[PDB]
């Protein structure tokens, strides 16, 4: 099924190198890079979702990033991926990008945010394609022989390649709480909150409207958004929802590994 | 040109007159484009890929693109015992030195 | 002690005798206060005064 | 080509998790103690020990 992306949404995750040399939480964290195509094509999985938007519908001109609590739209025209030099993207649908890439010891993927910032994530990655045949050639000639190889085919089909989805963990946010003097109030920007304190608090729990916790000191207060009605990929580098795992669901990841001649 | 401190602007000498241009069109590249990481007045910080040359350039108000190129062998020294290319998720902290991003005196 | 000079008369480097708005009340002459001495430690405070201006709205 | 499969890490605040041991082709799991992970907008756990 192709329109699974009504159910599941983009996210922030911890990127090791946000282009400036510092690690930070990024809309563009790349979770896996895979290079099984002997033709040297590269399949990249990213925390964006592309080919769709907010108001959950396919749109080949857009992608959606997570603007911390709310999914938000940006133009596909300003997605990029580069290695030692610019790659040409050969397909993008959902979490997945195909690229054709020059040899390089890094992969950096990025986009322009709706507020005209540029965001990227950079991983160490030794991209050096295998040679097909007996000549270390650089780009295909207008005359030659054909040899067997393999490619991530440019089709967004039901591939029988599957990735699992889970609901988010409770998302913490220090701005859900304010010290009104002598008490702390939990405040609710229309997402249901879980909260906990140890200020003699007998009544930790949940709310869908603003609440006061009496005697409370903001250091001894904790709050997180909890009723997520959308799912995520169950990546490393975001917490699991519970010890048991979670209630699942799947996505068929596009671009299957066809055999073909080069 | 009016000495106002607009972050989005830069000024250059058009013959006898200071003249303005857009910050977003300043670039520095070596073998490939460098991430600028700070600028003020005459100075730029950049993080650059390895390369045997350096060029800085900007687009003029009159849409023409200026650049300047020097030979400059850049190959930054290793930290620790591995010739790595970009920082990992997992590793060890080692002491090194950096141009701090703050424009302090 | 430390001090600064108006090419002849001498004063403590908190301000030049022209006072704030200096570069707009003795234009370019303001910079010659730094020509014939900049070797004494106080001269960055003369620079701090010389290139600071006090328009009608200011109220510290 | 092997695939290494890694689910989201379970982090428990304020108490020890324990190894939910299972037979899978080269399975491994480990419990790391005294973590204090941050999400984008705050610490995930309540306490820092």
């Amino acid at each position, epitope marked *: 099924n192709f329109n699974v992306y009504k159910a599941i949404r983009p996210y*922030l995750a911890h990127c090791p190198d946000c282009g400036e040399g510092h690690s930070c939480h990024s809309p563009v964290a790349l979770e896996r890079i895979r290079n099984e195509a002997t033709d040297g094509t590269l399949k990249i999985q990213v925390s964006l979702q592309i080919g769709i938007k907010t108001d959950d519908s396919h749109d080949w001109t857009k992608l959606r990033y997570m603007d911390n609590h709310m999914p938000a739209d940006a133009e596909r025209a300003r997605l990029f991926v580069r290695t030692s030099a610019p790659c040409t993207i050969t397909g993008t649908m959902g979490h997945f990008i195909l690229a054709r890439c020059p040899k390089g010891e890094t992969l950096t993927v990025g986009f322009t945010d709706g507020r005209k910032i540029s965001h990227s994530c950079t991983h160490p990655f030794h991209h050096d394609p295998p040679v097909i045949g007996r000549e270390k050639f650089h780009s295909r000639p207008q005359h030659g022989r054909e040899l067997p190889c393999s490619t991530y085919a440019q089709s967004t089909a039901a591939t029988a390649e599957e990735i699992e989805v889970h609901m988010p963990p409770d998302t913490p946010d220090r701005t859900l709480m304010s010290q009104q003097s002598g008490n702390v109030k939990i405040t609710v920007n229309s997402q249901t909150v879980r909260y906990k304190c140890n200020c003699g608090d007998s009544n930790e729990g949940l709310t869908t409207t603003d609440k006061v916790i009496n005697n409370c000191k903001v250091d001894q207060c904790h709050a997180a958004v909890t009723n997520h009605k959308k799912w995520q990929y169950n990546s490393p580098l975001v917490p699991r929802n519970a010890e048991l795992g979670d209630r699942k669901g799947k996505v068929h990841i596009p671009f299957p590994l066809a055999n073909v001649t080069c | 040109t009016d000495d106002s401190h607009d972050w989005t602007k830069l000024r250059y000498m058009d013959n006898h007159m200071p003249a303005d241009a857009e910050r977003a069109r300043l670039f520095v590249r070596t073998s490939a484009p460098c991430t600028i990481t700070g600028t003020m007045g005459h100075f730029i910080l950049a993080r650059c890929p390895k390369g045997e040359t350096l060029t800085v350039g900007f687009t003029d108000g009159r849409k023409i693109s200026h650049s300047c190129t020097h030979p400059f062998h850049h190959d930054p020294p290793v930290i620790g015992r591995e010739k790595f290319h970009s920082r990992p998720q997992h590793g060890r902290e080692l002491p090194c030195s950096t141009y*701090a991003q*703050s424009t302090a005196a | 002690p430390v001090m600064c000079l108006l090419a002849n008369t001498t004063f403590p480097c908190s301000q030049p005798p022209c006072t704030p708005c200096c570069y707009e009340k003795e234009p370019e002459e303001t910079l010659r206060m730094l020509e014939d001495n900049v070797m004494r430690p106080g001269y960055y405070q003369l620079l701090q005064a010389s290139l600071t201006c006090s*328009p009608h709205r200011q109220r510290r | 080509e092997y695939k290494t499969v890694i689910p989201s890490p379970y982090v428990k605040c304020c108490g020890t998790a324990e190894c939910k041991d299972k037979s899978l082709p080269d399975y491994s799991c480990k419990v790391f103690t005294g973590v204090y992970p941050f999400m984008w907008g705050g610490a995930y756990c309540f306490c820092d020990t």
Partner: antibody, heavy 127, light 107 residues
Framework: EVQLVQSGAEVKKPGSSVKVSCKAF????????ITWVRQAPGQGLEWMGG????????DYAQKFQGRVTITADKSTSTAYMELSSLRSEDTAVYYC????????????????????WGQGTTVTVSS | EIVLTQSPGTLSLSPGERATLSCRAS?????LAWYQQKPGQAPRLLIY???IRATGIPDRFSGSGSGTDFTLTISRLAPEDFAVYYC?????????FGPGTKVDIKR
């Protein structure tokens, strides 16, 4: 020195599009890293994400662009917001009277200076 | 990330005493700075930090810290020194404002 000036309070209806006033002075006579912070009553401070140092392009922080969907003026000292289609929950003091707020991701960095503060206009979402 | 955590949530002192405020973060790298709010009053700069420092009120304030946490101290509290006191480090990548510390001179 730098000095900031605003209108005392704005009497506004919910669902309107509203200018929020500023001019900046005090040692500059023209623009210098102007930005906004906005605080609803009983909240802690929050930098008004639509306006980090907007003096040649309009900002947003992460979050914002909900009902706080907003643009901000670059022009000489006159850092006006246009806060558009606001709601009752946006009743706050809007402190334009605020110091150079050095940004990032965006690759440039700013001085510490003398700093500046002051008043914050109460946009009084009321009927 | 970073998550500026002011360690004291609330304080009370006699006039004549010295207050000290502390803030904990995972890394710093650029100047976090201190500002305060008396109920209904306009803020002003107390102090800047991270490696250098500069301070806006004629000096009865000082600020310092490295390797763990960052601090502000007020020498001899006396007059209208009642406020909530905050520290912050501006926009950039997702990172938020400080939570604030209430302090005042005793009635």
């Amino acid at each position: 020195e730098v000095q900031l000036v605003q209108s005392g309070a704005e009497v506004k209806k919910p669902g309107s599009s509203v200018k929020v006033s500023c001019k900046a002075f005090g040692g500059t006579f023209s623009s210098y890293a102007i930005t906004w912070v906005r605080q609803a009553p009983g909240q802690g401070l929050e930098w008004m994400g639509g306006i980090i140092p907007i003096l040649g392009t309009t900002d947003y922080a992460q979050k914002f662009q909900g009902r706080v969907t907003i643009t901000a003026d670059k022009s000489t000292s006159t850092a006006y917001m246009e806060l558009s289609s606001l709601r009752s929950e946006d009743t706050a003091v809007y402190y334009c009277a605020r110091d150079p707020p050095t940004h990032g991701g965006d690759f440039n960095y700013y001085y510490y200076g003398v700093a500046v503060w002051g008043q914050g206009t109460t946009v009084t979402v009321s009927s | 990330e970073i998550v500026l955590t002011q360690s004291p949530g609330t304080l009370s002192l006699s006039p004549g005493e010295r207050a000290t405020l502390s803030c904990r973060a995972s890394q710093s790298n650029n100047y976090l700075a201190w500002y305060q709010q008396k109920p209904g009053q306009a803020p002003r700069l107390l102090i800047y930090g991270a490696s250098i420092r500069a301070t806006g009120i004629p000096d009865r304030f000082s600020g310092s810290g490295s390797g763990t946490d960052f601090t502000l101290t007020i020498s001899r509290l006396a007059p209208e020194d009642f406020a909530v006191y905050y520290c912050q480090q501006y926009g950039s990548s997702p990172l938020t404002f400080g939570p604030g510390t209430k302090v005042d001179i005793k009635r």
